[PDB]
Design a protein around this nucleic acid. Sequence first.
DNA 1: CGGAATGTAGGC
DNA 2: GCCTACATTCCG
Lengths: 67, 68
Amino acid sequence: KRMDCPALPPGWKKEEVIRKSGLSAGKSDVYYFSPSGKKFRSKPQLARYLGNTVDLSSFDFRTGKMM
Amino acid sequence: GKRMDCPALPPGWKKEEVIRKSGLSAGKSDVYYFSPSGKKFRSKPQLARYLGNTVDLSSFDFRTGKMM
DNA sequence: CGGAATGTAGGC
DNA sequence: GCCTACATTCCG
């Protein structure tokens, strides 16, 4: 389920992956993919790769949408 | 981190206070308790739910570990 | 997936 | 406006 994320620049994808077991069973992890295919696991990490090129202040990392 | 015995609780219960290093609440602290087996507790009701009627926590000050 | 580290809603 | 209590992130 690597789906296009319309809130980021073209080529950027989003994946949500369900945790299958343990204490956090049924919660999920959200990942982003740049055009090259770099995997990003957090909003600060994403903000660092992009820097001043994209304003992520309103960006909701979990849903992939601007608030 | 230092785990301090909490004399006010039953034998073996310990307390730790951790300073937040960054973010909005930087400089504030969080207090945690540990059972003698080492399970971590983060609030007074969590601690009350675990101990049940073995201890009365009505007067227990979570922050300081002191009965008031 | 865990869990230290931090965010944050709602009671006060 | 601040704190309690618990929700959630973020990196290992």
